[PDB]
Design an enzyme around this catalytic site. Sequence first.
Site, short mmCIF file in Angstrom:
data_model
loop_
_atom_site.label_atom_id
_atom_site.label_comp_id
_atom_site.label_asym_id
_atom_site.label_seq_id
_atom_site.Cartn_x
_atom_site.Cartn_y
_atom_site.Cartn_z
N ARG A 83 9.60 10.21 -8.04
CA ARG A 83 9.05 8.89 -8.38
C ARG A 83 7.58 8.95 -8.72
NH1 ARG A 83 12.84 4.49 -6.89
NH2 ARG A 83 11.11 3.26 -7.80
N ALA A 84 7.12 7.91 -9.40
CA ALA A 84 5.77 7.95 -9.97
C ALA A 84 4.58 7.90 -8.95
CB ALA A 84 5.65 6.83 -10.99
N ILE A 85 4.67 7.05 -7.94
CA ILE A 85 3.62 6.97 -6.94
C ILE A 85 3.31 8.35 -6.37
CG2 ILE A 85 3.20 6.23 -4.53
CD1 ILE A 85 4.17 3.37 -5.59
N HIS A 94 0.85 -1.17 0.00
CA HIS A 94 0.00 0.00 0.00
C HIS A 94 0.91 1.25 0.00
CE1 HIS A 94 -3.53 2.41 0.64
NE2 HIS A 94 -4.28 1.41 1.07
N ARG A 153 2.56 -1.52 -12.14
CA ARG A 153 1.43 -0.68 -11.80
C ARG A 153 1.06 0.43 -12.78
NH1 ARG A 153 -0.01 2.55 -7.32
NH2 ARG A 153 -0.43 4.20 -8.92
N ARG A 157 8.76 6.04 1.70
CA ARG A 157 10.15 5.93 1.24
C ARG A 157 10.52 7.22 0.49
NH1 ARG A 157 7.34 5.27 -2.86
NH2 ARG A 157 7.97 4.86 -5.00
N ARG A 187 14.09 -6.11 -6.49
CA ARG A 187 14.21 -5.05 -7.50
C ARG A 187 15.23 -4.03 -7.08
NH1 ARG A 187 10.21 -0.51 -10.02
NH2 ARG A 187 9.93 0.06 -7.83
N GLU A 233 11.41 1.89 -18.54
CA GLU A 233 10.51 2.92 -18.05
C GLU A 233 10.26 4.09 -19.04
OE1 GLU A 233 10.93 3.92 -13.98
OE2 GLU A 233 12.09 2.13 -13.45
N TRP A 239 6.59 -7.96 -3.34
CA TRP A 239 7.67 -6.99 -3.43
C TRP A 239 8.12 -6.60 -2.02
CZ3 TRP A 239 7.93 -2.96 -7.99
CH2 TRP A 239 8.15 -3.70 -9.17
N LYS A 295 -13.96 10.81 -10.61
CA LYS A 295 -13.47 11.05 -9.27
C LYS A 295 -12.80 12.43 -9.15
CE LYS A 295 -12.31 6.16 -8.47
NZ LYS A 295 -11.15 5.24 -8.60
N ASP A 310 5.03 4.66 -14.67
CA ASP A 310 6.40 5.10 -14.90
C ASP A 310 6.51 5.76 -16.26
OD1 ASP A 310 7.11 4.01 -12.40
OD2 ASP A 310 8.21 2.32 -13.25
N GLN A 327 -10.36 -4.07 -2.24
CA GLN A 327 -11.46 -4.30 -3.19
C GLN A 327 -11.32 -5.67 -3.83
OE1 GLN A 327 -14.78 -1.80 -3.66
NE2 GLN A 327 -14.05 -2.26 -5.78
#
Lengths: 138, 929, 929
Positions: free
Chosen positions: C750-752, C165, C622, C737, C437, C547, C273, C812, C584, C660
Amino acid sequence: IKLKSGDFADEANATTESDIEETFKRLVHKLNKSPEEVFDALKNQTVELVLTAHPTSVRRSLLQKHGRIRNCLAQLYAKDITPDDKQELDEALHREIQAAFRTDEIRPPTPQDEMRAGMSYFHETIWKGVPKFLRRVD
Amino acid sequence: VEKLASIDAQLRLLVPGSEDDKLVEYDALLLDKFLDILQDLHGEDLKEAVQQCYELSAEYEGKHDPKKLEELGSLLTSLDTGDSIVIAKAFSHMLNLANLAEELQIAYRRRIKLKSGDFADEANATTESDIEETFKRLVHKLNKSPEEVFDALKNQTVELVLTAHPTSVRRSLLQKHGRIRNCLAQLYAKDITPDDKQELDEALHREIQAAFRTDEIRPPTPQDEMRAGMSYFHETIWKGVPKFLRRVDTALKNIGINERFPYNAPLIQFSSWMGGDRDGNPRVTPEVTRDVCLLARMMTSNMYFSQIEDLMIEMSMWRCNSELRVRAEELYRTARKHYIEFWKRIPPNQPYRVILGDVRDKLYNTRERSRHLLVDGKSDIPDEAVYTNVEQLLEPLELCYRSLCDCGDHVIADGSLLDFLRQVSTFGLSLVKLDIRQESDRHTEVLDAITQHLGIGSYREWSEEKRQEWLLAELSGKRPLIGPDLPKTEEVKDCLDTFKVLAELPSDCFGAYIISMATSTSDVLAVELLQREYHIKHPLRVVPLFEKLADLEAAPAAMTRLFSMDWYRNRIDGKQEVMIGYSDSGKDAGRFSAAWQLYKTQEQIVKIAKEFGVKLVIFHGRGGTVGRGGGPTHLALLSQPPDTINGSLRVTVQGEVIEQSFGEEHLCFRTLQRFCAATLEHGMNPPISPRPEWRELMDQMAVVATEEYRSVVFKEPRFVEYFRLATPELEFGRMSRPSKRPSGGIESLRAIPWIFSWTQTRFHLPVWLGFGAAFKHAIQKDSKNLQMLQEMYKTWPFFRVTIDLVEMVFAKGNPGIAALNDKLLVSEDLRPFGESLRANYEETKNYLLKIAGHKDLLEGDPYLKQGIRLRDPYITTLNVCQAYTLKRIRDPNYHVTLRPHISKEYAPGLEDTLILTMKGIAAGMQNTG
Amino acid sequence: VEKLASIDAQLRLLVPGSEDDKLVEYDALLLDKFLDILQDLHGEDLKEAVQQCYELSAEYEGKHDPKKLEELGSLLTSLDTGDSIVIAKAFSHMLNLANLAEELQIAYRRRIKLKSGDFADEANATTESDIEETFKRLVHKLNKSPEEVFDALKNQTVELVLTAHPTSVRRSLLQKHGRIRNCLAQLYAKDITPDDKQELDEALHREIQAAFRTDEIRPPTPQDEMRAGMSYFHETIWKGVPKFLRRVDTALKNIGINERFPYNAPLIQFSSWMGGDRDGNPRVTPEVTRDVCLLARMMTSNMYFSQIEDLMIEMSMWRCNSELRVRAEELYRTARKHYIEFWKRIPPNQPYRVILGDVRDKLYNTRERSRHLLVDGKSDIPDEAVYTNVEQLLEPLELCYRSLCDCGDHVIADGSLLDFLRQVSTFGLSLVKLDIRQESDRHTEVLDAITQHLGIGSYREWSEEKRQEWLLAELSGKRPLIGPDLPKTEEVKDCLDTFKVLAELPSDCFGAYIISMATSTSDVLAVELLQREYHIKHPLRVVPLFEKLADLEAAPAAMTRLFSMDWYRNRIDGKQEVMIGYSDSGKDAGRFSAAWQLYKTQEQIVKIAKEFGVKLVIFHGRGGTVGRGGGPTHLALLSQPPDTINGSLRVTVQGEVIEQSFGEEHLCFRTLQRFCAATLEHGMNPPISPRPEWRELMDQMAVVATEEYRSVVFKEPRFVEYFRLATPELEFGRMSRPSKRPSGGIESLRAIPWIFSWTQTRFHLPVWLGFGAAFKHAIQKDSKNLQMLQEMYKTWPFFRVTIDLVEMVFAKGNPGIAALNDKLLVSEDLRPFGESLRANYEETKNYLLKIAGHKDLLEGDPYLKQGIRLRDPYITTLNVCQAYTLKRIRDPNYHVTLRPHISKEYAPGLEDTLILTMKGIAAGMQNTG
Ligand SMILES: O=P(O)(O)OC[C@H]1O[C@H](O)[C@H](O)[C@@H](O)[C@@H]1O
Ligand SMILES: O=P(O)(O)OC[C@H]1O[C@H](O)[C@H](O)[C@@H](O)[C@@H]1O
């Protein structure tokens, strides 16, 4: 009620009282009468209902409104019923109450009319009722 | 497409059918699935053989043509040992299925919404009162305040004493029965997919087979027989109790009490005879008893232990009161794990968990000490590390509980925590307390050894007055009676060692010391003295069990004398429990005279306790109307003589009834429910007292009934030879435990065997014999008595309940089986004696009907009748199979042409077939006497 | 009498309502119960405060009056730190409730019975195909034999890779969510008593409170974060898998295959992961990785262990084949227990139990070795005593299984035993295998240290051709590269030690070694070499993750070169896996151009693998349409380019979707179901290939979209200051992180974080930006393109699925929040820049609509829309609360008059309120990019 005590008190209430078949069966099994004897008693039985006039009595029109209202109401409570049919039954109901409410004229009436009243209730219910019941006897 | 609708159709014939009445469908499906299984495993050929038997039995159950029975005989008797074993298994297994279906039907049958208010309504699950209705009746129909009811309840205790199954089933097999019952329950739910149905089908099919194939051929030790019990509790009671107590809580809301039933109020208590009762049973040694205590202690600790981890997860809260926060800090501070859920250390960040972790370790230790003691005999584990007393285990839970409320979280505190408190408080450290039972003569034998060894004469030779004089003297003696160097027979040593065991073990393991075959004041003092000799710190209460009619007639004098002794009055501290045993007393004098006598004895003993300021508890041994299970128990309890319960019920739950009463969560719940409700109501709403005419007629009928019963059973010299022949009684007697306490005769034979022998046979003599003479004589003396008897059946609960039980038995009876037996097993000279008894059966039954005002048996109770009608064909097949097997066993030279072997596959003999048969019948018959 | 009907009434306004549509009732009840709880705990005053916020948010969600938003502001911003914390908790908690209700509604919504057959039907749970329907489509619509389907399936693998998460919830709290969801489910069942309803009510009320009061303020270690996972599996997947595989069995019956899906066919595999992925994350050390392997091994053994005891009880059978009977005898013979269910010895009377007892001990030992290794570092426990390999654990189960069939009991063998086999075979000794990774540059840093220390120059300085030449030489080198005395930075040591860990641990712990930021052939060889250096016996497969767009454009050349090398061709043994990452790549070039590029790259790499005889697996990282969960995943998978799955699916299950997808047994089941069905169908029924016009237009739009995206994000120098202000991105960056791999800029971010920042804000820039330019330009170049685009949306799954996802995000989205943010947090000079972006939002949305042929967002999907409309008011309150909190944090001198404190009772600051807010919003938004 499905299983009844068998007490005579059960016969004082519509939910517990005995229908014609249950009566036959009580007579046959609890009282050692043959079907033929019961059938025979019944064949010779007479029931006479003497109708008297209402001591204050209602109009043939107004009766039928009472009926229509009672049916609308009965129908509003049925599953598998559409939003539309519900909507339309609603206004039907609403409408028929008003139609009754507005049938309220101020008068005495002759024995003839007061009796011509009666000939309604029979039309309305007993005329059809009797065959229905006798078929149940069958 | 459809084997089932046909099997349904042919099952309907047996009982005509309706709304939520699924029983016939349930039975049909189960049977249809079971047949397929027989086919897969044993082949078409056998399946048909099984169907044929069924068809014949069913055809028989409808018409009652003795021809059918013989055709059945020709079939069954023509089967080799191998095939007959299989049929016997099959029918014996279809029965268990039919019972599951019935449990399920009973569970989900609809309650009647408006009830007559008659007490008869309490004899039936659909109409009986739940706890709320009971409260309401008491409040509104009886002018008690909610507070008074709540108060009565708070002080009420209900103790269920579990006895061992007189034939008893495996913990595995139980759970299969559960799984089968659930699959079945689930197949009947709307909004169910074709797929789920398909998968539930195979699930069902599979679980029946798994049960069928769990059938190995055997004796087992008291330890295992008891380790059985610890299952049923897991399975149902352990969860049941909190569920019910929460219902009590809800019921109290709805009459306006704004608090929950105190979690420590000991409303429900359980007890056991397993490893305790050694009466006529030398397998139950002291070592056995030591082992069942340790097992109990162990398993209970284990139960608390396997659920603590779930409570710990649930108790994720961090807000606590200081009282707790301290004790948590302490515990984290004192830290530095064998299992795994919480195998870590725990942050004081979450204090409730810290406490419960300690609790867990203590529970684990308590488990382990009991485990090591049990297998080694020593254990190097400090009392500090372990719960030796329930208060120690409650305390931390009460802590958590209080903390929660104080932080504003009572709502959470009343969830699992509360359930857990209630469990702990109900079940303590030992799930059941163990009663000890031994027969009076044994204590006499012991005392006699002592007196003789002391050189003062023979306790046996002494008169009652002397025994009492001596016993009281030694009860205040200033020096021990017993040396290590006392000469002891094995029995005397066994008996004395039982007391060494009682002294060594913690007292929260034990309940009462019951004296079988009690008759006198001395009998009870004797036990008191031996307890003093062994310096048992908390002696068990002594409970005389008065069995024979004479012993019952003498009991009041005995209790009065006891209560007159200061030594004794002061030891018992205001409380006396007395035991009674319907089957026992009815073996002496007939069921009728025993019923009536027990009513009066209770009345007199109550009166006597009242006079001396003693709270009297009556422990209902087996045989009662009150041990029937189901609704009938409800009315039976309310039917008790006034003031005999007085807030404290103690009753035997007969092994042959434990499944019906507890095996399914809903029935479990309602069992607990009615015991609690009836007990409560009775103290505030006794039944009417019998009219003096009724007492008078009852006294008159008792003499005649006892006369008839004794005439036939004891006086007639032909009787025992008849019994021995017409009945598997002898073969039963090569087993549970020695059924003759080798002396010879019926008076010597124990009651379970007595009842059981005639139940196998569908004739049930022990239950009705003497009712017929009593009824006939009372009516022939005066036809107005019929009216009186009927008024009694209508108006006097005791009487009603007494007649209903006998009626139920006649409904499970079939004299044709008895007749077949005569013809196969009994010699020509004794057949008219049999005929005579069958004649008495009929005549008794007919009077009984005339009195209840029924044309047919069970008119009052169609659902029960339906249950019985459905079981019968299966039972009938077993009776017949049994009868011929008994022939082949008894007559080495009876032979008939055997059909070529029918079962396929892909060492056992007649004795094995007979056992199968004895157990099928017994499980089809459930309780009778 | 009725707070609820009103709350229902006011909830209906938000979404007009119908049959099995209980969602509004569910939400209403939950909300009404939750309010009472707020009242009890914090007082009328606060409860109203919470209602007011809701009323305002709801009023806003209907009309969209910016006034309402401000009124809300006035309220929220006027609350002291204490009260705002409470409101933030409250709304954050009503969301979780609304999600449970939705899970439940989704679970029980009725399937449509007759379906159009269009592929669109597969985008929705009510209309998508279950496994049987899929089989049938393949058999009947596609001329495959049952045998061919069965065969495809037997060889199919589906691997779900679980990621952490990005914000993740507690094992306790999960179970409360479950209990609440069940109480709710149960309250809606007919044939339910007033009492049960009453008791379920308080059960519900209680469990919401218990959740609300589990709210302590925090960081947690990778070990715990992972120990989280082992919950969800317990909770749902562990049971789910057998249930689904049994459905596969039933589905195979119904198309005429008369056997069950082989229990060892590896259809479903799980991976993780957690403790594995160390990319830009130095908290994930070697020791961490060693610990997650040992935990995995432990817990898995524990699971097998806690259920074995139940299988042992079930396996009461005594009839076995000889193969088994021998091995049982052996085991009883070799006998002479820490836990308790079977704490005894076991008679060979029951052989299946003897085996399973051994198995249990071995499982316990396997549990304990892993436990000791984990906490001590040594463990004195022989490989003999323990399962080091899954075959060892299967073998005894296969034994039992075979024995049963051979004795004629296959039907029993296909019950729990089968489930257990399937579990063992699916989950092995380590529930999940761990992927490793690390980013390419790290391997470079390591190799550079090595080359320099060897005196041969700098690997970093070498050209690609040189790196390859050197790497291959050393891959066949005849002497080690690495001494113990090699100079190592902490990073290089960390990286090298990871390989020491991979060598020391059993290979059944690990999956793939993923190389983040892959770009070349050398990148993969590098990892191969280091694996050889550490003499890893079973090296992990190396998986490049390409990426950036350029890196994607170069990938084919890189893979071709790899496949050209004999050293490599022979190591990989016919199999290559390549990873891709939608988020990414879309951070580089926009979501649109990334989507299209990834379609093509897969096509090319497939073609290339085909040419070299290599089976290629594409690991979906993702961001995909394919990681949406629910039906949309179904169609997304079927929408993949032809031959890209080829019997082997591997996809990331994003943490923000695990609830979900798996948290409820029905959804769990259907998740597993669609993954298996879609995978199967695709290999036999690819989507149509794009028409060349479509490729051509897609290429044209990609350039424009990438141009727009880069113009705004990278080229515009105002952008980062905007981002930093309009968005909680910086504050997020004082955490999971390090979200910047301190370098500075978006390319570094980073992407998240990128996705998450703009999701918080309801603006979602990363998901749509560039779609508008692309659409506008294509239509303005030529109005006939609109028609083409629409035909593409109607007919080209890829395209459809691509547009649906963006559509869902706009649903949304709410630009008013973005606008409020500008006004509160952004300086006057940057507001027109914001306005400009909002303008682009609108224009993009409108084109998107015009293309899907919808008037309003989600016309195709009313149920989804209803879900969103219901969540919104809660989210809106959090957005607003968040915005002002961000103000107060950023501006020490912004102050407004605080209302006197509102909460009662019977240290925390703004930062805490902000976290609550960040997590509520995140859980209300679920997945987007
Ligand atoms: O009846 P017995 O043969 O003595 O066997 C045991 C039974 O005996 C008595 O009747 C007791 O009242 C019961 O609690 C018990 O189950
Ligand atoms: O996207 P990141 O910031 O690198 O974080 C982690 C994610 O990254 C990639 O996009 C991967 O494809 C996923 O399997 C993972 O969840």
